[PDB]
TrEMBL record, chain A:
Residues 152-203 form the LysM domain. This is LysM domain/BON superfamily protein. Gene3D superfamilies: LysM domain. It comes from Clostridioides difficile. It comes from the Bacteria.
From TrEMBL, chain B:
The lineage of its organism: Bacteria, Bacillati, Bacillota, Clostridia, Peptostreptococcales. This is Protein of uncharacterized function (DUF2001). It comes from the Bacteria.
Length: 206, 130
């Protein structure tokens, strides 16, 4: 069995391809290295430490009627929207055994002469990576991708405190004044940041 | 319903204006390289006309070296089919025809020396329509 899942997160959409990737999947791997010649010795291969971005590509058709399904036009609009998404997409391919964050490089649809409802698709993905730009000591590596998304507006719960909201929803937790200093948050929240109520709608920054 | 067919006995053929009465078979077709292209919105494929090409086959019993002597020179073939049960006759002429191959030699056992000719023709004229 083979399936393809694209789990967009900045748009909480879990797209499942209605149709398997036509003829054959294939992924390359090429060690990042350089060749250097030396006088009276000849060529040599020097490995370069960094890794290499590798691509996955295939083609499909989005059928009009088939198991969950949606209109091909909307699906193309969905994917074409995702092409410009800066944030990464999670691609999972069951039978091929691929699982990792990717981003769509190129996308193309096509209407054949017959079968006007369907849309032949040819899509390409790129392996995604992240750029993570005192008292030196060994600590946990920052290998975990931070792909998680939350609503831009928060409804305060009963046990919440403004510091707790900052940490859960903005990371460090000391970031709470960023939430408070927004004038809308200042208006809804009382003049005391330490006091808050269940309900109040609050707008995290960015 | 009535009998008004035609028979090959009525066929009269003038090869370059000469009655080659010994030809006991003839056929000529005028085909077109009809392009067929498929449109996006139309379910059924669209056929577009193209340039026409005239081919003809003609075989009979040898009685002379006419065709071998003729060579690949251009010439004309006038075909006349006449209804005898009722008056009226069809008359066709292949406007400009050339041989595709000279049946230079052909013979076998005690059989009669048959001759087979194949060629092409540029155009035609319909001189009478029955």
């Amino acid at each position: 069995v083979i399936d393809i899942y694209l789990k967009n997160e900045k748009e909480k959409i879990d797209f499942h391809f209605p149709v398997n990737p036509q003829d054959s999947l294939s992924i390359k791997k090429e060690k990042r290295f350089e060749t250097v010649d030396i006088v009276n010795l000849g060529e040599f291969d020097i490995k370069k430490e960094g890794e290499k971005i590798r691509e996955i590509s295939f083609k499909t058709f989005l059928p009009n009627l088939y198991s969950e399904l949606k209109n091909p036009i909307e699906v193309v609009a969905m994917l074409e929207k995702w092409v410009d998404q800066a944030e990464p997409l999670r691609l999972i391919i069951t039978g091929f055994g691929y699982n990792g964050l990717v981003t769509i490089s190129s996308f193309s649809n096509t209407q054949t002469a017959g079968r006007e409802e369907d849309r032949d698709i040819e899509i390409t993905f790129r392996t995604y990576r992240e750029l993570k730009i005192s008292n030196t000591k060994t600590d946990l590596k920052d290998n975990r991708p931070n792909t998680q998304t939350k609503s831009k507006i928060y409804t305060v719960k009963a046990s919440d405190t403004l510091y707790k909201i900052a940490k859960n929803l903005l990371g460090k937790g000391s970031r709470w004044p960023e939430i408070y200093n927004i004038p809308e948050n200042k208006k809804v929240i009382g003049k005391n940041p330490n006091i808050i109520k269940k309900g109040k709608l609050v707008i995290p920054s960015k | 319903e009535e009998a008004s067919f035609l028979n090959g006995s009525d066929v009269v053929i003038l090869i370059d204006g000469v009655e080659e009465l010994y030809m006991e078979e003839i056929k000529a077709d005028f085909e077109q390289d009809e392009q067929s292209i498929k449109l996006l919105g139309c379910q059924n494929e669209i056929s577009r006309v193209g340039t026409t090409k005239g081919s003809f086959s003609l075989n009979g019993y040898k009685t002379d070296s006419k065709f071998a002597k003729l060579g690949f020179r251009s010439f004309e073939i006038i075909y006349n089919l006449s209804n005898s049960e009722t008056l009226g006759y069809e008359s066709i002429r292949l406007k400009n025809c050339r041989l595709k191959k000279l049946p230079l030699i052909n013979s076998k056992a005690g059989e009669i020396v048959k001759i087979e000719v194949e060629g092409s023709f540029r155009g035609y004229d319909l001189l009478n329509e029955l």
